[PDB]
Structures are given as structure tokens and as C-alpha cells.
Amino acid sequence: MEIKRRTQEERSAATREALITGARKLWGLRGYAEVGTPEIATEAGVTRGAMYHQFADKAALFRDVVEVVEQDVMARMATLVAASGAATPADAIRAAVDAWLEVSGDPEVRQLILLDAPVVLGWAGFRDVAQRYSLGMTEQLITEAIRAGQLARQPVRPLAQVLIGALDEAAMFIATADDPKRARRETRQVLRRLIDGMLNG
């Protein structure tokens, strides 16, 4: 029965991927509140029953969209830091700040992660997502700066958690601004002062 089981699993996975892809596209453009699951099923080319089979409700589909978008946010940030030509751990942290403002400025990321997710997931769910995706990259950037003597030896997690709070509030300030270009410049300038006050190099 293994070909039959694997075939049904692969078909389920393809349906799931089409639904997430469709939902990510339409909610990214219009917002969660403005696109219903029937339109998303049509976009994905699946029936309502195929959708019900994969997702209990609209919010369950949104939770899976956030996972895929967060995975792409962190991969894009890692690509931009890798391509930055950062010569030291301190330069990699500055590159990571620039990458966060760039990727969180993507209109789809702004809409799904910064505007919809805190409301649709609620506080606990949104903070659990932010945490699962932010902590590893932040702790490793700190660890490498300590190892190079560019940051004081200290417990990594308390510093990581405070910086994640500062960086996520910076992104939210820009996302909710009516003049986001000015907000992004002003916020970039605050984070430059905060990071450059911390880093020894």
C-alpha cells in the first residue's frame, strides 16, 4: 500500500502548496480581510472540498501562509547579508539591519507579517512566530561579534531578545506610517545610532 499512500500524500501536498501560494498572492495584495477562501480556491484551481480537507478555516490557511513567508523573509535576509561584502561580524550585523528594513518593506511582507499577522494570529501566536524565526539569526550574529571581540562578552539571549524587540518595533513603526519613506529613513538612523553605540567596530 506504500505507492497508494505516497500518491495520496503527494497529491495532498500539491493541493496545500497551491492554496498557500494563491492565498499568499491575493492576501499580500489586498489584505486578509478583503479576500475570501472561495476566491483563493479558484486562484489555486482546487475545489472547496479540497480546501476544507487541508484547512479547518480561513485562519488555519493564514497560519501556513505566515510560516512560508517567514521562511522566505529569513532566507532573503541571509542572502542580502551574504552578498553585502561584510568583512567583520560587526559589518554583518549592520548588513542584517539594512536587510530587515529592506525585506520588511516588501509590500507583501508588510501586509501579511506586519499588518495582518498580529491581528489574525493574536499576540501569543504572532510573538511565537517572530521568536521562532528571529532568535537563531540574532543569537548567531551576536555570538560571532563576541568571538571577534566586537561585542562585550555577555549572555547572548538577553541581548538578542532586547534587540529583537527594538528591531520588530522599528519595522512596525515604518509599516504603520502614512509617509513610510521618511519613517524608514528616521528609523534606519535610530537603529544606526543604537547598533553603532553597542558595537566595538
Add this chain to the structure above:
Amino acid sequence: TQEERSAATREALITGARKLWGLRGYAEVGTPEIATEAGVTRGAMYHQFADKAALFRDVVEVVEQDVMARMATLVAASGAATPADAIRAAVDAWLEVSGDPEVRQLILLDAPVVLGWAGFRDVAQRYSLGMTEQLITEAIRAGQLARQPVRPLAQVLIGALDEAAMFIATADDPKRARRETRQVLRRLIDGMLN
């Protein structure tokens, strides 16, 4: 008067709810228990508060008012001689007041969940921004912070300060978490203060 009697009933309910939810959390104490603590009938309680969440919203207001009054008292008594020293005193005052067990449970743990993201952010901003922006404005005026628009720095610092408090709130060793987090916050602000 009827208004004075209504106000006494309201005060008994807010006081009782603050006490019981302060100890056990919003999720773990129902309105029947609170009405018993307050010595108020359920009918008289539902007349004042549509539902559990409505009573909680009024508890958060009274607790937030006390948090900010206590912050102002501690900074006033700190002996801070300069705007930079007032900011340093306010960081210490926030870790002291957010360490109060009732503030920890009601503001750091329950309010974001019960009020929801948007509701909580509105209350947190309405209570945090005045004091934060005043402290920053005085430091900029004294030359001790870089010339810059106040609101962006205020919002990023409130994010750091609230995240520090919430990290301590759920720590396995809160005393240790507080010490290590106080060091981070003092170093973060010292890197920007002249």
C-alpha cells in the same frame, strides 16, 4: 446619591478583579468569583460591565495609571542631576515597577492577550509615550542625545523596554534575567547618551 452608590459598586468590582486576576491571571478567575470577592450581585456587576473583558479593560486602566505614577515617583526620588541620569533612573524604575507581581500578570502577560494586539498597543502607547518623549526631549535639549525627531527613537526604545520586561516576566530565574537585562538596557542607552 445613585451615582455615588454606582461608583462604590464599580470600585469594589475593579478592586476585587485587580486582586484576583493579579494573583492567578485573567484566564483562571471567573466573574462569579470576582462578584463574591466584591460583595456585589451578578446583576449589579452585569449592569456595570457587559462581560468579563469589559471589567478587565477597566482594571488595565487603573493599573497603567498606577504604573506611570510609580515610575514618576521613583524617577523624582532618584536624585538624577541631568536628563541622561533621568533616563537611566527611568530604566531602573521600569524594571522595579514591571517586577511587581500584579503588574507582571495583568500588564505583561494578560493585557496583550485579552485586549488583543491593536487594543493593547493603543493602551500601551497612551500610557508610555508621554513620559518617554519628555525624557528624550529633555536629553536632546541638553545635548546628551543626538538631534533627531523624538517619536521614532521613543517607539524603538519602548519596544526594547517592553520586550525586556516580558523576557523577565517568563524567565525561569527572574532575578538573574532582571540583572542581565538591566545590563543590556543600560549599555544600549549608554551607547547613545553623551
